[PDB]
Paper text:
Despite attempts to crystallize the complex, we could only achieve two crystal forms of METTL6 bound to SAH and the complex disintegrated during cryo-EM grid preparation. To determine whether tRNA binding to METTL6 induces conformational changes in the enzyme, we compared our structural model to the crystal structures of METTL6 bound to either SAM or SAH, but without an RNA ligand. The methyltransferase core of all models aligns well. Deviations occur exclusively in the m3C-RBD, in particular in the divergent N-terminal region, the substrate-binding loop and the β-extension. All RNA-free structures display disordered substrate-binding loops, which seem to adopt their shape only in contact with the tRNA, and a conserved helix following the substrate-binding loop is rearranged on interaction with the ligand. Our data suggest some degree of flexibility in the region of the β-extension hairpin, a region that is completely unresolved in the crystal structures, suggesting its plasticity for tRNASer accommodation. Thus, while the core of METTL6 is rigid, parts of the m3C-RBD seem to be more ductile, to accommodate the tRNA.
Numbering used by the authors: 41 to 50, 60 to 66, 79 to 193, 218 to 246, 259 to 269
Write the structure that this text describes.
């Protein structure tokens, strides 16, 4: 698994864009996130990625500042988010083009990990491929997955823009 994702380092925000605290799972090289962080200085981010070759690229980018963003390697499927992220401390979690890469059987080990750090009021902005080594999701299969892992859906919607899905789920 991670082997394939690490080989690649040798799927972008699309108008998805205060004391906001945010986590970007599968941050990547943080191409969209780092610009956002410069534009607003309030935002503190915890960026986590499966591949270490990606985390070094993230540190290399000039935009990277250590006091507006914390970057750490983590496999959400097995590694624990709480060890680097304080509990119920995040106002936004963004799963963008990342749940697809995770296997369906393990796909909820992440929604649960993200769940502990998410503040009870705050939600999880989602952006991923839909249908009607990634996998694609029908709008119902996905809403069930947050429901199975305890989150409550505010928005689930396919975008035609190969398909995309825009979904917002709120932790109770
Ligand atoms: N189980 C897993 N644990 C951690 N990161 C994972 C993962 N499965 C996929 N990823 C990460 O998912 C990311 C998706 S692509 C990068 C993010 C995208 N550019 C954005 O703007 O959000 C990759 O960086 C990959 O390493």
């Amino acid at each position: 698994a991670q082997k394939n994702w690490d080989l690649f380092y040798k799927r972008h925000w699309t108008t998805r864009e205060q004391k906001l605290t945010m986590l970007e799972a599968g941050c990547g090289v943080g191409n969209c996130l780092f610009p956002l962080l410069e534009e607003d200085p309030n935002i503190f981010a915890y960026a986590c990625d499966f591949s270490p070759r990606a985390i070094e690229y993230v540190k290399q980018n000039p935009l990277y500042d250590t006091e507006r963003c914390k970057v750490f390697q983590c496999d959400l499927t097995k590694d624990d988010l709480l060890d680097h992220v304080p509990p119920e401390s995040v106002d936004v979690v963004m799963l963008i083009f990342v749940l697809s890469a995770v296997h369906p059987d393990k796909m909820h080990l992440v929604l649960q990990n993200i769940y502990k750090v998410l503040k009870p009021g705050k939600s999880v902005l989602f952006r991923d491929y839909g249908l009607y080594r990634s996998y694609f999701f029908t709008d119902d299969f996905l809403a069930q997955l947050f429901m199975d892992t305890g989150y409550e859906e505010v928005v689930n919607e396919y975008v035609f823009r190969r398909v995309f899905l825009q979904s917002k789920f709120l932790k109770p």
